[PDB]
Structures are given as C-alpha cells and as structure tokens.
C-alpha cells in the first residue's frame, strides 16, 4: 500500500484526491491515507478523519486546535496524533511511513510544505503551481541535493504533458532537471486552455467584469484564487513558467491554445513533428491519481470518454490584448532572475483585490506590470538557505509594492 | 547508421519511405537504403537505383529481369547484386547488412516477405495489413520462435496507437504477443477513419457509385486497392482485426470513429480512463519514419501541425447499414479460426471486381458475406509450415469461391 499525506485536504484538489483514493480502495488496500493537513476547516477535516482515520491530523491555525480535539473525541477506536502549525507539518514530512504527498495548498504558502517534502526525500504530487513559478530555480537546487525526491505534476496540463511523454525516457530524468526536454525529444508544448468565462467578450465588455462573473468558470470547479486566475488567463501565464521549469522547454516553444471544450488537456510536439495529446472530461481525479500511480496506471470506474457524444473539438489563439496577463508572464519568464517571483507575488495581491471588488479587470495586469517594471535584478545566491531567504524577501517586497501601487490610486 | 530495405519501393508506401529517408538524411546522415524490391516497374526501379545506389536490387517478375540489368549498366561506378523473384527476396531478407525492412507490398502477397523478414530476425516495418489479417495467429507463432524479430506497425492508426504507449512497457513484450494490452494497461482503442468519399451518401446513392468516384479519396493519396477499401470502409474493418492481433485488444474493445479531418489518427484509452492520441496532418511519412526510429525519434523538417489553423475536429459513429463491410470484419474477427483469411481473400476479389466496374457497391459485402457463410471452421495445424500451407489453401479457396459467386450472379 502506498502511504499518502494530503496537504490542503479540505479544498478542491484535496477533496478530489480523497474522492479518487476512495474509489480505488474498493477491494484492495491500494492507498493508505496517513495524514491530513488543513488551515482552519475543522468541521470538514473531522468528517474526513472519520472516514479515512489517518494517523496524523494537522491544523495550521493553532486557534482551532481545541475545537478539533473536541470533535475528534467522538470517533471511537481512534487515537490520532493531532499536530499544529509549521512544526506539525515538518513532523509529517519527516515521517518514514509516508511515501507520497499531495500538495493542494493554495498560493505561495504551498512552498513551505513542498520544500520540506523534498528535504525528506518524498514523492511530491504537486498541484500548487505558485511554488514552481516563484521558486523554480530553488526547488531544482533542492532536488539536486535530495536525489530520491521527485516532483510529479498534478496541474492538469502538466499531468497531460507528463502522460504524453514516453516513460522509458521520463524515468531517465526528473521534473526540474536540466535536459529534460532533450531527453524526451520535445520540440514544443501546446498549453491548452478553456479560455475561462470571458473568452467571447469585447475589450469594452472586459472593462466591466466583476469577481462574481469571474467565479463562474465554464468547465472546472476549483478554489477562488485559481478561478480568478482563469478569468484573467493569469493561470495560463503561470502555467507557461511552470512548463519551462518542470520540463526545461524554451519560452519560444510554449504555445497557449484556447480549447473551450476542455477535452484535450495539452499536447506535445516531438522533434519529428508528431504530436501526442491527452484527453479526458474536465476532472482532476485523473491527473491526481496519475501522480500517485506513476509510472503505473490502476483501474478506475470513472466515466469513459465518449468522443462521438463530444462530437466537436475546437482550437484558436488567445488574444493578448484581451488577456495581457499572459504577455506579462512570458516577459517575466524570459527576463528570468526573480521576475517570476515578482509576477506571482504581485498577482496574489491583484487577484485578491479584484476578488474583493477593489479594482477592475485591467487594473490587475496594470498593477502586476508596474511591480515588474519596479523590480531590479539581483544576483542569485549560490547556497540554498540564502536563496530561500532571498526568495522570501523579494516575494514579500513585491506584495507590499503591489499594495502601495493600489493604495496610491484607489 | 540504419540499414534499410524497402519492399514495394515504387508504390505509395515505398515512395513516401524513400522521401522521408532522403529528407531526414539532409539534416543528419542516419539512414542507408540497402535494397529495393518491386514487382514489374523496371524503369521506376532503375530511376530509384540511380538516386539511392543500393547494394541489392530485386524484381519479382522474371520477364523484366534482363531489362533491369540492361538499364542498370548505364550507371557509373555502380555494381549491385541484381536479383529475381522469391529467391532474390529471401536473399535480401537473409543479408546481415540489413537491419530493418519496410514492407509496402500490397495484398496477401505481402505475407511472403513479412514471414521471411521475421524468420531472419529483422525489424519489420509493416504497412501491409492483409498479412496480419489473413495470417495474424501464424505471424504470432513465428515471432515466438524468432525472438529477436519485431513487427513495428506502419499502418497509420496502429502507428498512432504504438506512439501513445510507454516504451518501458512495450519493451517487456512486442506487437502480436498475447497479453500486450494487459502489459500496456490498454482498455479500449478508438480507430479513427476519414470516412472515405461516400461518408455523406444515402443508401440510394451508394447503390450506384462507381469505382471512379471511389478512387477520389478526400485525405490520403494511396494505391488503388486500399483506396477502394477506404470507400467501402473495409479498410477499417481489416484494421479492427489488425488491432486485435497487433495489440491483443478484444473486439468489443475496439471502436471505429469517423474523424473527417484526419488529424487524430487514433486514440488509446487506458485502464484509469485517461485517453492518449497521436496527431498529425494526413501524411504517411510520420508513421513510416517512427517505425524506422523506434524506440527513439529524430529531427525532421516536416511542416509543424498548426492546431489553430486546423481549428475544428469532428467525431461521429459510422453507419453499419451504409458500410456493411465493417460489420462483416467484426463478425469474421469474432468467429476467429481462418475466417479473417476468408474475409481478406474474398474482399481481394470483390474489391477488384468493383475496381473494374463488374459489380455494384452493395455486391461487395454481398459476395464476402456468402463466402464467409460457405466456409467451415477448420482444425488449426500446430507446426508453422503446415499452418502456412493451410492459410494459402484457404485464401486461394476463398478467392475461387468469391469468383464463383460473382459468376453465378453474372
Ligand atoms: N482546484 C483545482 O482543480 C486545481 C488546483 N490547482 C492548484 O492547487 C492549489 C490548491 O488549489 P484549490 O484546491 O483549488 O484551492 P482551495 O481554495 O480549494 O483549497 C486550499 C486548501 O489549502 C488549505 N490551506 C490554505 N492555507 C494552508 C496552510 N497555511 N496550511 C495548511 N493548509 C492550508 C486550505 O485549508 P482550509 O480549508 O482550512 O482553508 C484548503 O484545504 C493551488 O495552488 C492551485 O493552483 C492546480 C490545478 C487545478
Ligand atoms: N498507401 C498508403 O498510404 C497505406 C498503405 N497501407 C498498406 O501498404 C501496402 C501497400 O500499399 P500501397 O503503397 O498503397 O500500394 P501500391 O499499390 O501503391 O504499391 C504496391 C507496391 O508493391 C509492389 N509489389 C506488388 N507485388 C509485389 C511482389 N510480388 N513483390 C515485390 N513487390 C510487389 C508494387 O510494385 P510495382 O510498382 O512493380 O507494381 C508496388 O511497389 C498495402 O498492404 C496497404 O494496405 C497501409 C496504410 C497506408
Ligand atoms: C484544471 C487546471 O489545471 N487548471 O489550471 C484550471 C484550468 C483553467 P483554464 O482551462 O486555463 O481556464
Ligand atoms: C492512412 C491509413 O492508414 N489508411 O489505412 C488509409 C486511411 C483510410 P480512412 O482514413 O479510413 O478513410
Ligand atoms: Ca478556538
Ligand atoms: Ca506516456
Ligand atoms: Mg492547470
Ligand atoms: Mg490505416
């Protein structure tokens, strides 16, 4: 049995992970849910702990500890180790009876657990794209030091790419490793997007969109932050940088394509021009399960894709005028250095401002752009503890800069 | 370098093979054309000889053997082994100078060179599907005896399938082995078809279509035999049986789908319900090239797939009332034994009868259907040599039968 920890178990990714683990555990003890880790949702965590009876339970916010302890006492035959904060997360990460960790923690915050998972040589099923975008160079360093650690992508497009490749060649390398794409004969990546709710809007219509419209994603049910990133296509911007770091593909060889049916999840063009693509309904259970079974597959009872019923697949190029967040992500990635860190940080601020009705659609890219323009290149630290400190200070600088730019105007 | 023999070098498959070989060699010299083998086309063979200067030349037809040597004398500083008929073919197959053999000979005839290529432990890049359909279980026997021999599918849909797999799983087995689909975690195959030129016709219009209309394929430029088969969709019926043998996929697990754009060449559904497809423009150079480079890929200067430009892909189920040959192949395949031999043989006659305007569209399936019911399941010989003789005898019986049914009605 594979022993799995679910980090951010009460969110969209974490719930999907538990869902598919349940379906796969019908007869055989394929997975063992050893640990659940959330921020604040004690009631929801208690419902999950009742079903999965994990050895470890961790709550980031220490103020709900008593509430957790009190709810858990009602479950009989159950004495879990109940842990708290960063300490509790580090304990679970260092446990010998944990093989694989699903990071479904949102935002920059997800980097702490990713880093600690890697330092303890775990398999990391990483949904959290922010840690890769803002700290790609650093995780590469870490994976170099902790050679048994692996990042297996959960982000649906990156899972799709991973699946399209030949495992005979993927097994001779590692995500984030130099020459990944050369070993895998990758010529270019088609990054597929639903295009989000705003894909058919004119410029003047875009000017007026609000967060409530933005939260109605046509194809994926997700947490609020990634849903807002999908409306602006900053999500796809972030995924361009994620592609570059994970798979070592040049920015000029990453193409964003709007595929509104969201059946094809991304495509790989190899050096002979043959293209391989991965297809399924829009359902995170596949990419989540694959990260946990790779390099094997296991049987599921998920609904089989009916191509005849689907009937039509369409593709077009996205408009960079309507979705300038994509342009900004390419620019930050191409500039290199800590610009992706600045991108991600200033987007976290602008995303949250827009979610809370404090700025308009085009102010998001305007704030991000200004912060990027403000930032001065810094020499990258050679050693890892200092590079991590550098990353934290720049991220934190960029959030405060975005807030100041916001406060100057509105 | 890779030493290649091309069998049927003057046909559609053969001509595209030499083309991709030549083009790829302009980038980096990796292929060497060691042998060319044709039926009757002395002049076209001579023109090809002058370009590629192969070590071996062979012509199947004894009566133009002298004409060939006479033409080949005109070439400066060139002294090749010029061979003749079945013996010349066997000679080339047994040459240690030859690594891989492209079989682009049409019809049942392609079986002879396929079997000698296997007996000599070569990589067989097999385009000819009639040999798999009428002799599948015998080729399977032969590959269990000659353990270093490999069939690498060139037929475009089967190459598509093969390209979608992980080669660390493929290398644990090989094409045409039992359990291939279980080792590769295959659940279902989607076999994509252009639909041919009659895809939109009524039953009434189909009744009166002529071979001239059938030869205008909307997507693939190919030889006459397979083009006629694509019009009736018998090609896809033969391809269902070919899928079953190459990949050990159950007949109830193979789905034919009409994809009129011919961008997606086929799809593989794995046991987790994830689906992987190979995509390219309708161009046989890709599947041919891959058969010669597997398990690697090489750079080409082929036009890159522009998904935005392609814009729409469509998928629907074929009508078995309009294309009854599809039904017949499933029925023959499910029956097993020598029924596929009979299906292939009687189609060879009906196809040719239709090509030459002697019968009407629905007479094709009418004839094949009557030959099939006339056949009786026969005990399968357990030594390879007697099984082969059985196959020839049954194939030959089926052709005489089909001819005799035609003669009755005419
Ligand atoms: N949802 C999706 O389909 C996809 C998500 N992703 C990525 O996955 C990540 C998570 O996304 P999603 O599931 O949608 O987000 P959600 O908002 O649904 O869930 C976030 C989860 O993380 C937990 N969490 C937040 N902070 C902490 C913390 N400090 N310590 C421990 N746990 C914490 C939350 O706990 P609590 O409930 O207590 O607040 C919650 O369980 C994001 O980075 C996103 O980009 C990527 C592709 C698709
Ligand atoms: N064409 C295509 O794109 C595809 C073809 N296939 C399969 O590939 C095979 C070949 O098809 P295609 O190229 O279209 O056929 P063609 O009709 O274009 O050419 C057939 C070739 O085989 C040669 N030939 C015939 N008999 C013999 C023999 N006795 N000994 C040596 N050579 C012989 C012919 O020589 P000669 O010129 O002297 O007559 C010719 O070169 C078929 O089985 C077909 O089903 C499968 C998928 C796609
Ligand atoms: C499922 C997934 O991995 N996402 O990143 C959300 C995709 C949203 P869009 O398809 O880019 O709008
Ligand atoms: C290229 C190929 O492999 N063929 O078998 C001919 C295709 C015929 P259709 O696509 O089924 O009409
Ligand atoms: Ca409290
Ligand atoms: Ca794969
Ligand atoms: Mg994604
Ligand atoms: Mg074919």
Curated annotation (Swiss-Prot), chains A, B:
Pathway terms, separated by semicolons: Isoprenoid biosynthesis; isopentenyl diphosphate biosynthesis via DXP pathway; isopentenyl diphosphate from 1-deoxy-D-xylulose 5-phosphate: step 1/6
Keywords: Apicoplast, Isoprene biosynthesis, Magnesium, Manganese, Metal-binding, NADP, Oxidoreductase, Plastid, Transit peptide
Transmembrane helix recorded as keyword: no
Residue numbers binding Mg(2+): 155, 157, 239
Enzyme class: oxidoreductase
Keyword Nuclease in annotation: no
Catalysis: reaction(s): 2-C-methyl-D-erythritol 4-phosphate + NADP(+) = 1-deoxy-D-xylulose 5-phosphate + NADPH + H(+)
Biological processes per GO annotation: isopentenyl diphosphate biosynthetic process, methylerythritol 4-phosphate pathway involved in terpenoid biosynthetic process
Cellular component annotations (GO), alphabetically ordered: apicoplast
EC number(s) from the headed UniProt entry: 1.1.1.267
Residues that hold Mn(2+) according to the record: 155, 157, 239
Family under the similarity heading: Belongs to the DXR family.
Quaternary structure (record): Homodimer.
Protein name: 1-deoxy-D-xylulose 5-phosphate reductoisomerase, apicoplastic
Gene: DXR
Portion of the full sequence shown: 77 to 486 of 488
């Amino acid at each position: 049995p594979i022993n799995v920890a679910i980090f951010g178990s009460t969110g969209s990714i974490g719930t999907n992970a538990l869902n598919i683990i349940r379906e796969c555990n019908k007869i055989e003890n394929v997975f063992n849910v050893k640990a659940l880790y959330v921020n604040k949702s004690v009631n929801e965590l208690y419902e999950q702990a009742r079903e999965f009876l994990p050895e470890y339970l961790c709550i980031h916010d220490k103020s709900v500890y008593e509430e957790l302890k009190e709810l858990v006492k009602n479950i009989k035959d159950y004495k879990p180790i109940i842990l708290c904060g960063d300490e509790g997360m580090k304990e679970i990460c260092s446990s010998n009876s944990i093989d694989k960790i699903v990071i479904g923690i949102d935002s920059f915050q997800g980097l702490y657990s990713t880093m600690y998972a890697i330092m303890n040589n775990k398999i990391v099923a990483l949904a959290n794209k922010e840690s890769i975008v803002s700290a790609g160079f650093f995780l590469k360093k870490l994976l170099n030091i902790h050679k048994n650690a692996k990042i297996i992508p959960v982000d649906s497009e990156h899972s799709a790419i991973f699946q399209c490749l030949d495992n005979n060649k993927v097994l001779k390398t590692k995500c984030l490793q130099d020459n990944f794409s050369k070993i895998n004969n990758i010529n270019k990546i088609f990054l597929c997007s639903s295009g989000g709710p705003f894909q058919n809007l004119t410029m003047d219509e875009l000017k007026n969109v609000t967060s409530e419209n933005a939260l109605k994603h046509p194809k994926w049910k997700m947490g609020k932050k990634i849903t807002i990133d999908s409306a602006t296509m900053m999500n796809k911007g972030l995924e361009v940088i994620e592609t570059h770091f994970l798979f070592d593909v040049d920015y000029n060889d990453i193409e964003v394509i709007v595929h509104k049916e969201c059946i094809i999840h991304s495509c790989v063009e190899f050096i002979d021009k043959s293209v391989i693509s991965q297809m399924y309904y829009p359902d995170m259970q596949i990419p989540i399960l694959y990260s946990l079974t790779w390099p094997d597959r296991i049987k599921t009872n998920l609904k089989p894709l009916d191509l005849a019923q689907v009937s039509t697949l369409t593709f077009h190029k996205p408009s960079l005028e309507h979705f300038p967040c994509i342009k900004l992500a390419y620019q930050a990635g191409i500039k290199g250095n800590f610009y992706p860190t600045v991108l991600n940080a200033s987007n976290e601020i602008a995303n949250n401002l827009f979610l809370n009705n404090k700025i308009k659609y085009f102010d998001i890219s305007s704030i991000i752009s200004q912060v990027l323009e403000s930032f001065n290149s810094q020499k990258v630290s050679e050693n890892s503890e200092d590079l991590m400190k550098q990353i934290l200070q720049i991220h934190s600088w960029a959030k405060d800069k975005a807030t100041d730019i916001y406060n100057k105007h509105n």
